[PDB]
Structure formats: C-alpha cells, structure tokens
Design a protein around this nucleic acid. Structure first.
Lengths: 150, 203, 94, 96, 187
RNA sequence: UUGACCUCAAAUCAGGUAGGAGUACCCGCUGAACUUAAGCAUAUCAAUAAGCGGAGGAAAAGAAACCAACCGGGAUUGCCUUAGUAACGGCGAGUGAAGCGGCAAAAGCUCAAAUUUGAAAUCUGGUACCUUCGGUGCCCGAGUUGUAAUUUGGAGAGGG
RNA sequence: GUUCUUUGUAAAGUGCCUUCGAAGAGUCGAGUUGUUUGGGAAUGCAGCUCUAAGUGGGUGGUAAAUUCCAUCUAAAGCUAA
RNA sequence: UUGACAUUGUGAAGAGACAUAGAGGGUACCUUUAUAGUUUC
C-alpha cells in the first residue's frame, strides 16, 4: 500500500503543485513500546493494550501504574503474538490508539466502560494481595487428608 | 520510553519485585550449560547503553563463573622458600571475575569480537554475566562506519589483553595523582625509570 | 628528626635573596652612570627585582646616596631602613 | 579582589576580572521535570528495601540519634547517613 | 662522604646509549621537508595563544598556550569550527577570567586575519611562496610593567610593618572571629 | 483439524571465519631463589628470570570524575630537568616518584538517555541485468523487546 | 593543469526572544582480608559482607565533626605523529 | 575442627513492641480494645 501511495503522490505533487495534501489524514494504531509510553504521559492515548507474556517481564510492569497515574484506560490482553498480527509484525507487546474516526466513536466509548470496570477500578486492591500459594496435586491431596483427619 | 523506567527500577535490587526476579532467574541459569546463547538480552537498557544495536551481527552470550579466591596450585601446601611466600588460601587474583568470564566466551566464539559485558545475577557459588559480541565478517557490520573500527586487526581478542571496560579498570588506567605507578602501563613506566640513559656527550 | 612534610614541592619555597651590595647590577651599564649623576627625587630609576628573578631584598652592604625606587615581594628590617637613608621607597609588588 | 601584596588574607596581584560564561556541565546534578516524575513513580512500584524497613521502624521507636548510627553502618559514610535518614522522615511525614 | 648509587638491580640489560643523536636529527629534518611539500602553501604549525603561567615561581613570565577559547574566537568575529580550518588552534576547556590576556589574544587574532590570504574553493590558485613558521612571524613578547623613571612619593608606612601586620592578621583571624561570636551571644 | 508465536535443535544445507609458526620491541596474568644485610626471619635481589594467554608495523595511552592554590594552567607520548630530593625502611642494609619550566610532535571526537508517528524513512541475502573493491530493479527475510535522520555537555533541543 | 556532469523546492553556518536542558548501578563509596607502591590512620588492584545520591558525585597527600571556597563530571566508545 | 555473615524461602501457633482504628479518659495523657499491618525472640 505504501509503495502504491508514493507513486500516487509523485504525480500529484509534480503536476498539481500540491504539498502532499492529496493524501488524507491516516488513522492507525500505535504499537512501538518507546512510542506508546511517549503517547501516554501526554494524555494522548485512548486505549492501551498490554501483552501479558513478555520474556523480560521487567519491561512492562510499570505500565499499569503509569496508565493509572496519567489516567489512561489500559487493558491486559492475552498474547504477545496476537498483537503482532494486527500490526503486521511477529510480536508487538503493546498497542495503543490515539485517534478514532467519528462514526466509530460510540463503540469505543462503550468498550472503555467495560475495560475500566475490570482493570482501572480494581487497581487499588490489586496491590494489597500476593499470589502463588498453589501446590502440586500430590502435595495438595497429602495435606487435605490430614486436614480431613484433623 | 522504557529507557528510564527500566534503568531506575533496575537499581532497586532489594525491592520485593527484583528479589523475585532474582530468585527465579538464578534457578534457570544453573540448569543450563556454563556457556549458552541468550536469544535476546535480559536487560535491554543496560545492553543498549554499552554499544548494542539489535541488528544482524550482535550476539548475546551468558556465562557462569565460580566465586571466590584463587588457591595457589602448589602441591600439598609445599612452598619451598622464604616464609613471606608460604601462604596458600589467601591469594586474590588481580583480574576480576568479570574479565575471566570474557576470556571464556572469547576462546569459544573465536570468529566474534568481544564488545563489552555486564552483571546480571549472582549466587553463593557462582556469578552470572552476559557478554555482547560483534561479528566482523558480517556485511551489516563491515559497512556503516560507526562500528567498522572493530574489523581492524589490531582489535583481535580485546578481552585477553585487557582493553575492555573491566580490563582498563583492573590495570588501573585513569588520569590522576593516585595512578602514578600505572598510568600508561605498569611495565612501561617501570622499564622507563629503571633505565640508565647515556648520551654521546656525557652530561 | 623534625616533623614529616608530605608532598613537598619547591615552588612554594622559591625566594632567592639579593643583598644591597649588588642592587645596581640590575640596571645595565650604559644607564648605570646616568642615575648616579642625579640625586633627583624627580627621576628615580625604578628597579623591578621580580623581573630579574629575585624574591627577597636583604641588606648586607652599604649603597650610594642616590634615591632609588625598589619593587619586591619581601624586604627585611635593615634593608628597608637603609634605603630610606638614601631617600628611596619600597613598593610592595605581588 | 586581591590586596596587592605577597602575603595576607588575600594575597596576589590585582587584575581586572571578567566572570566567564557559565558552563553547562556544572549543572549535572539538577535533575529535570521528567525524572522528578519518574523517580517518584518507581518509588511506589518498588516499595521499600529491607534495611529501610528498619530505619522507619527505628525513627518511630528510638529517635533520630540511633538511626543515623545504623544508617552510617549499613551505608558507606556519615555524610550519606544524614540524607538517607532525612529521606525517611519525609516518608513518615507523607504518611500523615 | 656517603654516596648513593642505585645499581643492585640487573641494570646492564636496560642501558640505552644515544649514538643516533646526530642520526635522528638528520632523519627529523627530512620530516619537516616532506611535510612542507605535502602542506605546500601552509605554515607547518598553527597559531598559538598568549598565556600567563601558574605556580608562583613562574607567574612573572608569559607563555605560549594551547588554544585560544570559544570566547576569544567569537570576539574576533568568526566561529570555532571555521577557525580550525584557517589555521588557528581552539581550546575548549580553557577559561577567561583576566582582561589583559583577553585583550592580548583578540589583538593577536586581528593581526592574523590580515597577514593571511585564504584561497577560494573554486580554483585558479595564485602563487603565494609559503613561510615555514607561524610562531616566528607572531612572536611572544613580554608585557611592560613600569616606565624607567618615576618620582618618589613617600608616606612613612615603612613597608616591613606592613608585611608584619599582614602576616599577623592571617594567623589570628579565626580566634578573633570566635571571640566576637562568643561576645554577641551574651544574653 | 488448521495457522501463527517463543524457546531449542538437525543437515556432506548456502556463504564465511578461528586454530599453527615467529616472538627482537608490545599488552596482560602467574611468579621464584642464589644473592646484599659481614649470621637471619620483615626487607633486598623483584613487582625481575622461567611458565601461560594476545596483537602490530609499532603497540599501548588519549580529548580530564586532570594538575593546581597562581595574574592559574589545559588530551596522550617521549627527551633535558625537578632528584638521588619529598617520602618509605630490624629508620639498618637499602629503596624512591610527581606537579610547574624548556623542547620533539601536535588533531580532534561519537554513542546511550528526545515521538519519524502525516506514514522503518534503515540493513543482510537471493535473482536478473550492468560500467564489477561496486551499482540498479525485483522478491524473500531481519527488525517496533527500536533499525535510520536529529543531539554529546565545549553544548544542544522545541517554538517565535 | 583539463574534461564530463547539477547535484538542491536539498544541506550547513550566524543574530535575538521565550520554554526547556533527558547525561551510564551490585556501580561510586564504606568495612575487612590478601597483594602492592615512595603513599606515611591505609597508593592502586582483587575476594567477601554491606550498598548510594540528584543545587548531587569524585578530588583538594594526617584520621574525625562543623561551616565555606576551588576544580573537573566517573561507572560506555574511536583516533595519526 | 568450632562460631558469624551470605546462599535462605513460606506457614501455623506463642511471648512483646510499634504503626494505624475507635470508645472511654484524669498541647495533652493512660489504663483499654479492635482490626488490618510492619518485626522480635
């Protein structure tokens, strides 16, 4: 598409003395991680999606605090690979949407009303509990029969 | 960007998050071999500030070395000399552990050139490191003249002569009045001032 | 014997002495006779001992009667007193 | 401004000074608008380190005289021990 | 007399004798002629500033420094990056805190831009007959302190009592400051 | 069932590279004793010989987390000098530098850390042609867990 | 010395105003042990235990507290004679 | 060969101290009590 678009402009610039204003304004997702974090903390993003599995986990763990801090409705969607396909990459690890077309405005603001219900409002009590007390099923049934006999 | 939010959060090495990532990742590095390839750096901010650029020809190895002193290899504690030298267990090995871990992966990956290295994790028995290497045959490196200084054959085996970041520390090479005995090489400034200079017309 | 002095450097102790015996060798020969044939407070030949490379002016011998302006960093008691007998001053340059 | 003689409280020759342009790399320590936000953001993610747990448990218990004595020992020097304990009073003050 | 010779070490290995003193001098003047043909119109060395030396023993003199500054080059009316191509050394780490040196170097740069001619990039390259030394053309001359003859003015300050009392004030400065703050805190 | 991803493998897969010799000088590690103290144990010989690893036509060092206390110098190197001095030492034997001054040669610099976001603009390889230390067109890949342009503290950036 | 090519609505330099000015972590530093130097209440390097800061940090050749001033900007890199 | 520090985590009881969370209560005080906490054996 881009290689088709430039040859469209190269006639339109040279003939009609245009300022490359033959091309319309784009509307697309923003996906680079150094770019989404710069699109947060200017309050410029509308939704930010977050991949749960990142091999350096440390890369992403500041995003829900920074989305809560600047007030941006984040969400943790499953899969680093799923975000990659919709941005023509292999993996993407974040995805964010700055501008939306005006007709599709209502389906966006309806979607945020479900997303902030799960994530931005539970965030105060997510910090005050720990995870990971699960045991394997031999040790699980070992302590239950004791707890049954006790 | 995540340049600083990782850099500042790396420094909290006893917070409740980083001592969880420390205790999980120390397990995984024991179960692998001594020298094995990381497909990507675990610390992307620390690698990037040391000369890494994620393109074709930069290789990230991870290497594990033993921790402790250097026991002198004389047999049965026999020393055969004046009793200043009779010690064995208290000798301390002037090169750092970081520079030893560079020479290990340097002899294995011989076609590569060692760029730099950095700490990752440690244990009671081992320290863990991670060495950035550059491939001077690869045509992405032999162009783009920021990085084609490493192709030059004066830079063969930087790690073994002590020219890297931890090499110039353990030689004690910086400017100043504290570094008088070693400012331009210790054996050069020894040999200079223990040298009788005589002219044609004796001054 | 005495106390130890760490990091000694002989640039804090550069101060070569100059007796009032000499005191006229700093003036060249062809100008030397002209100021001797003038007792004038109007024109006293200015001597800059620091440019010649002498730190302190000490008084050892006796000087002629001619008044002289002397510039130096340090002078002593009898050296400064002997110049005022000749009617000359000492300007403490630094 | 010097006095013009060789010894004294202000020794040396008197010259006319010029006060040259301020170099940029004397202000290396002053941070930013940005890293004031970043460092405050990381402080609530990381939480507290374990020796700094005892420091705020020592100021509440036994004053600031003993707390500078421990924070000299855990840290390097004594001049760093003021700054860390004074930081820990700003944490207790921000708690109320 | 006791005499200290330091010869216990294996010193006969490291003995260097300079039989090449007259050899390397001839091999050095062939460098200053090979460079003078490669650098063919240009004066073989850059232009050096005027600097007053540190360390009380030597501050009476004046000395050729390394480069001018970013400030002396600006006051002469040219940028720093264009100055290095014309033939003028620029030192970025030096500072100006003295006015007499600052006026001395700007005067040294004004005279340099009149004595040179700079060839255009285009061509036609006129003959110029180079001069092998730039530091010979612009010599470092010592500044003048005073005139040869002045009139005697006298006020009886005796000039040794001055050095004695200047000595005595520095020795007792802090104790006199300690007495005053102990006096001022009375009630 | 089908298609990706991450990690790890296999090929006499396509194209590459390292080993060994020399070793006078160079950069590191490891490292003695005879000897001198009229004995000898700290010390000295010596931060040396032997041992081991690594380069070049030189190498190393280098654009200051410097020297200074002045009217301040201004990357490194080498020579003359400071100096057999300050200092170390059963204060005995013995050891022992540096700053300033004069000269040889002089040359400076770039990345990380700014949103290209009205367009990853970057690069390996293959193939076809060509004027072949390479160029252009095309197609696979690499890559957003950040490749180019922009900036390096002496500054510099966004605006007007 | 010549000849063929327009590279460029490209690139660079300079004045003034306003807002900014991001700058390297198991590191700097402290204890201790060994080694080492002319370095002496500790010159470097290394092992281990502890482990920093942002008008901060190192250094200013006698350890320590109090108050100032001076000077550079570390923990990443290239380069002839 | 013996001690300390590091590797070295998590529980349930017990014995304390604080931070918080109200009541009372003779800038405060202090016998009380709850909880959700940080730690001492």
């Amino acid at each position: 598409e881009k290689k088709e678009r430039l040859t469209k402009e190269a006639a339109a610039v040279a003939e009609g003395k245009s300022k490359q204003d033959a091309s319309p304004k784009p509307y697309a997702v923003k996906y680079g991680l150094n770019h989404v974090v710069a699109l947060i903390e200017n309050k410029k993003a509308k939704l930010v999606l977050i991949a749960n599995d990142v091999d350096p986990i440390e890369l992403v763990v500041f995003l829900p605090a920074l989305c809560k801090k600047m007030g941006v409705p984040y969400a943790i969607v499953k899969g680093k690979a799923r975000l990659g396909t919709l941005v023509n990459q292999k993996t993407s690890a974040v995805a964010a949407l700055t501008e939306v077309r005006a007709e599709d405005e209502a389906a966006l603001a309806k979607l945020v009303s479900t997303i902030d219900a799960n994530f931005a409002d539970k965030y105060d009590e997510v910090k005050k509990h720990w995870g990971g007390g699960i045991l394997g099923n031999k040790a699980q049934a070992k302590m239950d029969k004791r707890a049954k006999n006790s | 960007g995540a340049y600083k939010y990782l850099e500042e959060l790396q420094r909290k090495k006893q917070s409740d998050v980083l001592r969880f990532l420390q205790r999980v990742r120390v397990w995984e590095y024991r179960q692998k071999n001594v020298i094995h390839r990381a497909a990507r750096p675990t610390r992307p901010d620390k690698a990037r500030r040391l000369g890494y650029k994620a393109k074709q020809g930069f290789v990230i190895y991870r290497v594990r070395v033993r921790r402790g002193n250097r026991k002198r290899p004389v047999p049965k504690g026999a020393t055969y000399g004046k009793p200043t030298n009779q010690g064995v267990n208290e000798l301390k090995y002037q090169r750092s552990l970081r520079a030893t871990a560079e020479e290990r992966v340097g002899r294995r990956a011989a076609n590569l050139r060692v760029l730099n290295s950095y700490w990752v994790n440690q244990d009671s028995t081992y320290k863990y490191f991670e060495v950035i290497l550059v491939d001077p045959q690869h045509k992405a490196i032999r162009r783009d003249a920021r990085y084609n200084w490493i192709c030059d054959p004066v830079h063969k085996h930087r790690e073994a002569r002590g020219l890297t970041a931890t090499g110039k520390k353990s030689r004690g090479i910086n400017k100043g009045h504290k570094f008088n005995n070693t400012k331009a090489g210790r054996r050069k400034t020894w040999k200079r001032q223990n040298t009788l200079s005589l002219w044609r017309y004796r001054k | 014997v005495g106390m130890r002095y760490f990091h000694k450097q002989q640039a804090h102790f550069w101060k070569p002495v100059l007796n009032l015996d000499k005191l006229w060798t700093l003036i060249p020969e062809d100008k030397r006779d002209q100021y001797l044939k003038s007792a004038s407070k109007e024109t006293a030949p200015v001597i800059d001992t620091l440019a010649a490379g002498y730190g302190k002016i000490l008084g050892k011998g006796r000087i002629p009667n001619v008044p002289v302006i002397v510039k130096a960093r340090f002078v002593s008691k009898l050296a400064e007193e002997k110049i005022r007998a000749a009617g000359g001053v000492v300007e403490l340059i630094a | 401004v010097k006095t013009g003689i060789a010894i004294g409280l202000n020794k040396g020759k008197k010259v006319t000074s010029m006060t040259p342009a301020p170099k940029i790399s004397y202000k290396k320590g002053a941070a930013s608008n940005r890293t004031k936000f970043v460092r405050s953001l990381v402080r609530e993610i990381a939480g507290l380190s374990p020796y700094e747990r005892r420091l705020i448990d020592l100021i509440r218990n036994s004053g600031e005289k003993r707390a500078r004595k421990v924070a000299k020992k855990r840290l390097g020097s004594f001049t760093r021990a003021k700054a860390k304990v004074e930081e820990m009073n700003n944490i207790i003050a921000a708690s109320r | 007399p006791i005499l200290k010779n330091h010869f216990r070490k294996h010193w006969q290995e490291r003995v260097k004798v300079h039989f090449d003193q007259a050899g390397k001098k001839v091999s050095r003047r062939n460098a200053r002629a090979t460079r003078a043909a490669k650098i063919a119109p240009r004066p073989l060395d850059l232009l050096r500033p005027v600097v007053r030396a540190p360390t009380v023993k030597y501050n009476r003199k004046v000395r050729a420094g390394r480069g001018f500054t970013l400030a002396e080059v600006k006051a002469a009316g040219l940028t720093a990056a264009y100055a290095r191509t014309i033939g003028i050394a620029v030192d970025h780490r030096r500072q100006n805190r003295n006015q007499e040196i600052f006026d001395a170097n700007v005067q040294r740069l004004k005279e340099y831009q009149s004595k040179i001619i700079v060839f255009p990039r285009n061509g036609k390259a006129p003959e110029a007959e180079q001069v092998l030394s730039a530091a010979a053309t612009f010599p470092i001359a010592q500044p003048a302190t005073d005139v040869e003859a002045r009139a005697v003015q006298d006020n009886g300050e005796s000039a040794f009592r001055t050095l004695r009392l200047a000595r005595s004030e520095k020795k007792f400065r802090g104790i006199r400051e300690k007495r005053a703050r102990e006096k001022a805190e009375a009630e």
